[PDB]
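Memo to structure team: turn this sequence into structure tokens by end of day. - J.P.
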Amino acid sequence: EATRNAAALFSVDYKAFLNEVNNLNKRMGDLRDINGEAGAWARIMSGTGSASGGFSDNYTHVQVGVDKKHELDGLDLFTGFTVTHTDSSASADVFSGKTKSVGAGLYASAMFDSGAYIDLIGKYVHHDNEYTATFAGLGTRDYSTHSWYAGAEAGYRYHVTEDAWIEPQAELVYGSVSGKQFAWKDQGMHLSMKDKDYNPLIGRTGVDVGKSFSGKDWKVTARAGLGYQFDLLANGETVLRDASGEKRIKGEKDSRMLMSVGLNAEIRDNVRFGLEFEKSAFGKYNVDNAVNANFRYCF
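Reply from structure team:
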């Protein structure tokens, strides 16, 4: 059903918004064991996933930016600005979309000597997607709209031992994006398709242990643990019309799980080793992940 296609598109948009989440301590720079007062940084990654009924997607997201920071009486204040761009391609039974969400925002991050760090990010992007769909007579349509979302998080990387730090953390994010309003007159019937002002929110709780290895012989960032993400708000209401009647739809909560990072290894100022761990929990909602492994060295 074209309503099912629209619901799948809304779920894909929610997944993209969740992916718009980047690591506070890894992608956004660690608040602990990072003495970089001012400097530039970047992080580029890729992901892949799927759902039931043949829905799947693959995306690449790259972000960069700069930051300034200074210490205080037992506190390390930090802030900065960044930009990001996430391109994605999703394949379904009757829907094939190519989306691009490029934007920018600002972030803050502070930590102390007592083992507590507070981080936050927030950015606005412009999601524009060319989607080819047969059901409802959508054709090849370009749905473009802005989307501003900001999240906050708090972690406590307490010293579990001399070779690891135990970090419990929580996060909560709120985001708003304009709906996809277009006419389905290409199908013969009116079938007006539009959505209300979506204002999704999502919280998450995650625990981890991080190996603070050094010595240029270990020099790795081994981490383990688990985290669970539950939607704080799902207000993605949309309206569809048909000859027999009209319908309205909205979103519900989620119970997504997570995993850890594989190696994230290095030795010296000329070697960097990478390896990612992925999970494909097809039992719950036919979910999946994307992982990679590479390393860089020069003579």
